[PDB]
Design an enzyme around this catalytic site. Structure first.
Site, PDB file in Angstrom:
ATOM      1  N   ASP A 136       0.816  -1.231   0.000  1.00  0.00           N
ATOM      2  CA  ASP A 136       0.000   0.000   0.000  1.00  0.00           C
ATOM      3  C   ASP A 136       0.855   1.291   0.000  1.00  0.00           C
ATOM      4  O   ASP A 136       0.558   2.260   0.722  1.00  0.00           O
ATOM      5  CB  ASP A 136      -1.023  -0.019   1.162  1.00  0.00           C
ATOM      6  CG  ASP A 136      -2.144   1.029   1.008  1.00  0.00           C
ATOM      7  OD1 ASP A 136      -2.352   1.580  -0.094  1.00  0.00           O
ATOM      8  OD2 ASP A 136      -2.825   1.303   2.019  1.00  0.00           O
ATOM      9  N   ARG A 140      -0.261   9.439   0.190  1.00  0.00           N
ATOM     10  CA  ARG A 140      -0.990   9.476   1.481  1.00  0.00           C
ATOM     11  C   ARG A 140      -0.324   8.734   2.661  1.00  0.00           C
ATOM     12  O   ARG A 140      -0.597   9.067   3.818  1.00  0.00           O
ATOM     13  CB  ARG A 140      -2.434   8.956   1.305  1.00  0.00           C
ATOM     14  CG  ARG A 140      -2.564   7.474   0.953  1.00  0.00           C
ATOM     15  CD  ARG A 140      -4.008   7.014   0.855  1.00  0.00           C
ATOM     16  NE  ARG A 140      -4.061   5.620   0.401  1.00  0.00           N
ATOM     17  CZ  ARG A 140      -3.954   5.190  -0.866  1.00  0.00           C
ATOM     18  NH1 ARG A 140      -3.810   6.034  -1.903  1.00  0.00           N
ATOM     19  NH2 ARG A 140      -4.007   3.876  -1.107  1.00  0.00           N
ATOM     20  N   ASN A 141       0.489   7.713   2.359  1.00  0.00           N
ATOM     21  CA  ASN A 141       1.199   6.877   3.351  1.00  0.00           C
ATOM     22  C   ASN A 141       2.717   7.165   3.496  1.00  0.00           C
ATOM     23  O   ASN A 141       3.458   6.344   4.057  1.00  0.00           O
ATOM     24  CB  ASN A 141       0.952   5.390   3.015  1.00  0.00           C
ATOM     25  CG  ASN A 141      -0.518   4.987   3.139  1.00  0.00           C
ATOM     26  OD1 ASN A 141      -1.298   5.617   3.862  1.00  0.00           O
ATOM     27  ND2 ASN A 141      -0.899   3.919   2.441  1.00  0.00           N
ATOM     28  N   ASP A 154       2.384   3.201   7.451  1.00  0.00           N
ATOM     29  CA  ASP A 154       1.042   2.701   7.052  1.00  0.00           C
ATOM     30  C   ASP A 154       1.149   1.407   6.219  1.00  0.00           C
ATOM     31  O   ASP A 154       0.558   1.270   5.144  1.00  0.00           O
ATOM     32  CB  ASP A 154       0.197   3.815   6.372  1.00  0.00           C
ATOM     33  CG  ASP A 154      -0.677   4.568   7.356  1.00  0.00           C
ATOM     34  OD1 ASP A 154      -1.666   3.967   7.811  1.00  0.00           O
ATOM     35  OD2 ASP A 154      -0.389   5.746   7.663  1.00  0.00           O
TER      36      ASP A 154
HETATM   37  C1  LIG Z   1      -2.859  12.370   4.071  1.00  0.00           C
HETATM   38  C2  LIG Z   1      -3.377  12.580   5.515  1.00  0.00           C
HETATM   39  C3  LIG Z   1      -3.005  11.445   6.463  1.00  0.00           C
HETATM   40  O1  LIG Z   1      -3.520  10.382   6.161  1.00  0.00           O
HETATM   41  N1  LIG Z   1      -2.203  11.527   7.592  1.00  0.00           N
HETATM   42  C4  LIG Z   1      -1.509  12.750   8.089  1.00  0.00           C
HETATM   43  C5  LIG Z   1      -1.986  13.080   9.507  1.00  0.00           C
HETATM   44  N2  LIG Z   1      -1.736  11.910  10.391  1.00  0.00           N
HETATM   45  C6  LIG Z   1      -0.443  11.732  10.934  1.00  0.00           C
HETATM   46  N3  LIG Z   1       0.379  12.784  11.166  1.00  0.00           N
HETATM   47  C7  LIG Z   1       1.604  12.652  11.684  1.00  0.00           C
HETATM   48  C8  LIG Z   1       2.087  11.358  12.026  1.00  0.00           C
HETATM   49  N4  LIG Z   1       3.309  11.106  12.560  1.00  0.00           N
HETATM   50  C9  LIG Z   1       3.674   9.858  12.844  1.00  0.00           C
HETATM   51  N5  LIG Z   1       2.897   8.789  12.633  1.00  0.00           N
HETATM   52  C10 LIG Z   1       1.654   8.895  12.119  1.00  0.00           C
HETATM   53  N6  LIG Z   1       0.802   7.823  11.878  1.00  0.00           N
HETATM   54  C11 LIG Z   1       1.022   6.507  12.315  1.00  0.00           C
HETATM   55  C12 LIG Z   1       0.852   5.436  11.412  1.00  0.00           C
HETATM   56  C13 LIG Z   1       1.061   4.117  11.838  1.00  0.00           C
HETATM   57 CL1  LIG Z   1       0.863   2.790  10.733  1.00  0.00          CL
HETATM   58  C14 LIG Z   1       1.425   3.865  13.171  1.00  0.00           C
HETATM   59  O2  LIG Z   1       1.655   2.589  13.598  1.00  0.00           O
HETATM   60  C15 LIG Z   1       2.861   1.966  13.380  1.00  0.00           C
HETATM   61  C16 LIG Z   1       2.820   0.552  13.308  1.00  0.00           C
HETATM   62  C17 LIG Z   1       3.962  -0.148  13.093  1.00  0.00           C
HETATM   63  N7  LIG Z   1       5.152   0.510  12.947  1.00  0.00           N
HETATM   64  N8  LIG Z   1       6.453   0.043  12.721  1.00  0.00           N
HETATM   65  C18 LIG Z   1       7.236   1.090  12.654  1.00  0.00           C
HETATM   66  N9  LIG Z   1       6.529   2.206  12.821  1.00  0.00           N
HETATM   67  C19 LIG Z   1       5.249   1.882  13.001  1.00  0.00           C
HETATM   68  C20 LIG Z   1       4.076   2.636  13.219  1.00  0.00           C
HETATM   69  C21 LIG Z   1       1.593   4.931  14.066  1.00  0.00           C
HETATM   70 CL2  LIG Z   1       2.043   4.648  15.713  1.00  0.00          CL
HETATM   71  C22 LIG Z   1       1.381   6.239  13.649  1.00  0.00           C
HETATM   72  C23 LIG Z   1       1.195  10.255  11.779  1.00  0.00           C
HETATM   73  N10 LIG Z   1      -0.019  10.497  11.253  1.00  0.00           N
HETATM   74  C24 LIG Z   1      -2.462  10.715   9.869  1.00  0.00           C
HETATM   75  C25 LIG Z   1      -1.917  10.355   8.471  1.00  0.00           C
HETATM   76  C26 LIG Z   1      -3.900  12.584   2.955  1.00  0.00           C
HETATM   77  N11 LIG Z   1      -5.119  11.755   3.114  1.00  0.00           N
HETATM   78  C27 LIG Z   1      -5.829  11.490   1.840  1.00  0.00           C
HETATM   79  C28 LIG Z   1      -7.182  11.746   2.534  1.00  0.00           C
HETATM   80  F1  LIG Z   1      -7.789  10.608   3.082  1.00  0.00           F
HETATM   81  C29 LIG Z   1      -6.320  12.512   3.542  1.00  0.00           C
END
Ligand SMILES: *[C@@H](CC(=O)N1CCN(c2ncc3ncnc(Nc4cc(Cl)c(Oc5ccn6ncnc6c5)c(Cl)c4)c3n2)CC1)CN1CC(F)C1
Length: 272
Positions: A136, A140-141, A154
């Protein structure tokens, strides 16, 4: 080898950032015990309705990346175990790269776009080194630490259900057979590069997903982005070959975009 367990008293949730099928991501602060520091973090709380075997694949995929890691892939700092499972990582303060490129279309340079292409390729090379198929990869990811530092996150998986997909980024074999490999990740990399070079345009906009396999077999592909020279588009086209063996390797993509990053104005044409 070991895993760092963080107590609930060390963590504080501030704001909701987003969610999906597996959990909800919050903005927050980590204060480690016996230390006079504050660390800004993202906290992913897994959904309580999902079965134990479903959430198992998310945790196990993180434990593969135990050692040194890559600076262009998200790093698990630890976990917190209350009634819920909470995954903790460093906060990327500029959010996802798709939103970032759309907002800053007026003032982004050729150096910035080609640096991101190289960094994503380096991160994907590391995932191939540890034998982790993403499933994936999309704009976005990818998250933005700062405008010169991005990180892949993601990591994709199918939801295991007792009983009781991103078609426009997928390789042809993945749509028709559900076969996912490191070479199908390279297809998705090509589409991600197309998103960045069009300042976040929607791929195949207007075309329904059911029509995509027939168009790909006919030889139709996503158009050349207006800012790109043919040299850049040629790399995107090699990523979308039907024969998966003829697609380039991630280490070869690191080589190509590193070369283009050393003379960015030759290969990408910005107005300013
Ligand atoms: C994009 C908008 C969008 O989808 N996002 C931006 C805002 N969010 C965001 N901001 C900052 C940020 N910093 C750090 N981490 C995350 N997200 C996150 C993701 C995962 Cl998968 C996660 O778990 C793991 C699991 C396993 N693993 N191994 C190593 N590392 C990891 C992390 C964690 Cl803890 C945190 C984050 N998110 C959300 C994302 C545009 N979009 C299109 C429309 F739908 C909007």
């Amino acid at each position: 080898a070991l895993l760092r367990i963080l107590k609930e008293t060390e963590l504080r949730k501030v704001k909701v950032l987003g969610s999906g099928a597996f959990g909800t991501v919050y903005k927050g602060i980590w204060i480690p015990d016996g230390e006079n520091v504050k660390i800004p973090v993202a906290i992913k709380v897994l959904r309580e309705n999902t079965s134990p075997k479903a959430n198992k694949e998310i945790l196990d995929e993180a434990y593969v990346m135990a050692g040194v890691g890559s600076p262009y892939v998200s790093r698990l700092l630890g976990i917190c175990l209350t009634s819920t499972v909470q995954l903790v990582t460093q906060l990327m303060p500029y959010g996802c790269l798709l939103d970032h490129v759309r907002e800053n279309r007026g003032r982004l340079g050729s150096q910035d776009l080609l640096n991101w292409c190289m960094q994503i390729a380096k991160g994907m090379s590391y995932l191939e080194d540890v034998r982790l198929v993403h499933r994936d990869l999309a704009a976005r990811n990818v998250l933005v630490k700062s405008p010169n530092h991005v990180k892949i996150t993601d990591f994709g998986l199918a939801r295991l259900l007792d009983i009781d997909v991103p078609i426009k980024w997928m390789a042809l074999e993945s749509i028709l057979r559900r076969r996912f490999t490191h070479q199908s990740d390279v297809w998705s990399y090509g589409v991600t590069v197309w998103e960045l070079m069009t300042f976040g345009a929607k791929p195949y906009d207007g075309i329904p997903a059911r029509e995509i396999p027939d168009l790909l077999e006919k030889g139709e592909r996503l158009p050349q982005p207006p800012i790109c020279t043919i040299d850049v588009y040629m790399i995107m086209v090699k990523c979308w070959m039907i024969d998966s063996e003829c697609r380039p390797r991630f280490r070869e993509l690191v080589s190509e975009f590193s070369r283009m990053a050393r003379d960015p104005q030759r290969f990408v044409v910005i107005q300013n």
